[PDB]
Write an enzyme that holds these catalytic residues in place. Sequence first.
Site: not given
Lengths: 323, 323
Positions: B141, A137-139
């Site tokens: 992303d 989710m690469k928060i």
Amino acid sequence: MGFKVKLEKRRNAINTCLCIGLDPDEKDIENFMKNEKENNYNNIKKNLKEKYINNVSIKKDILLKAPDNIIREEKSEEFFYFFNHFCFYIINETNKYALTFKMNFAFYIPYGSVGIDVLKNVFDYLYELNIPTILDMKINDIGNTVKNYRKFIFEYLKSDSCTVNIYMGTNMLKDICYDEEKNKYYSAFVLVKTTNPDSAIFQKNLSLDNKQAYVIMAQEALNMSSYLNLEQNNEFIGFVVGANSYDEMNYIRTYFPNCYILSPGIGAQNGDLHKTLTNGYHKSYEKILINIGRAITKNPYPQKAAQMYYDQINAILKQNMES
Amino acid sequence: MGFKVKLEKRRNAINTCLCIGLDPDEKDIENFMKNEKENNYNNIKKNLKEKYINNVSIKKDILLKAPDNIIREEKSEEFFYFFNHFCFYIINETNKYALTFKMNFAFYIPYGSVGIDVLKNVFDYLYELNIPTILDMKINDIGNTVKNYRKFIFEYLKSDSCTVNIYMGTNMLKDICYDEEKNKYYSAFVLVKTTNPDSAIFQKNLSLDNKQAYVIMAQEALNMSSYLNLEQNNEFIGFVVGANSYDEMNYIRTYFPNCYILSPGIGAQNGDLHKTLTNGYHKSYEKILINIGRAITKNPYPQKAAQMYYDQINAILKQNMES
């Protein structure tokens, strides 16, 4: 009871470091519905046989209903049904070969609330099966804002871990990997920017040194792990290291010997599996998770696809062990 | 018809660069419900009077129902109702003073699908009112994965813009700000890592130069904007520049004269408004959006709070114009 024991426990059971990416696109879902309509819904029928489906949180009785009965009676839940049932199908089919499952949040949100009802139930289903989870989710946000993600990921979804983008500073990690109020500890993988490395000369000429830069960032993240007491609580902060970054991978595994690494990149038409795994190898090989997604989930025979990748990783682990 | 014209048009109408942050926490929502129960639901009643509420997508007839009727008859939609009604309340109350509204995705997801039904309707309500939107979601992303966010943000929510974290590379911007299939163009603000700057000596000693580094990144992002033809399509890629980073702000506005900047940071107990706005000032002052959130949304009188900040920005713009 941290993620670290979760990983070691399951490592001893199925002896792999294969990570299965569950990233279901709009095409996949449509394609599943089509094939199941055309095949008398045999995979959904297989899914309904399984006991855990009775343990998910959201519209259980819609998922439990007959597939013929869905299109006739519930034309409004048809997308939900087939979406949620495709993730189950991949899970039932491939879980024996999976050290972990990694879900990219991106694939679950573009339809609104509905993909998020399915993500919940996907995490419900995997928690009921006790398979280790990663939410990719690469928060990234300021400390007080990121507490919302901590809640969503670790409390609502009950994920074992997530991915994090700490470009803006390491200190956000305090509010993701640690909950002071509840005295709880969580694991995360941070993104590391790795080179070409044919582009290295251009960085030198720009006076940049991307290598000093990611090692500095790396150290700050392990510094945070120790400050947060995550290890003593069986949690960690590791790295997301692109599969084809053979240089950085080697350097990282070398200079940070026992760190946890998650390596995306390998697919059907690219990637050298042995090269990536060997560069990042650790005797405790849960410390080098190899993510394969589409090569499994878009293959017309996912379990065989999964079995092949499991078998390939097997042979590389054997070679590395005999060092 | 891009965001650029949207911004200029509304700039000429309300003459501000105030950005209102709508970041509703669990406390806010509980506090709204409590106050409305205790005040005979006067703000919800005010909200129901408004015509646009009839134009949102999700559970319209739940939101349209009487608040007494909600707790008695719909105890399961109570949280949805009061959540969704608090955002309306802030919007109805403060929109005249808002150049734009910025919603942080984080505040909308920790309860599952339900906050996402409200985010939709918040974006529905603001599109019906034609107020410029930012979704602060700090997406990041690989190119093919980020297309999902493009769909969610620009197609489902129909936001004018979002925030993006391009640490891992600028090329993701091609798949967020541009849709080849549909020949559509969208705007974004990228995160810029700005210094202390008392921490500058430590970077020198580490051989890092954070200043070269963010300017390099900055240029790559404007390079992408021109490559994507966003300007000619009335879209842009700008920067998210922390309010208290007076140095970087000045440097950026100086060396990239006509870029768009979004500046979060100012609140009730910190921030120098004049200093931030003056450092980032542009005659076309939609190019320096000043975000205030909690100072408005948690103030017991949001509109007065909003009016004060509007009035303060007014006076600084006047001072800057007379240069």
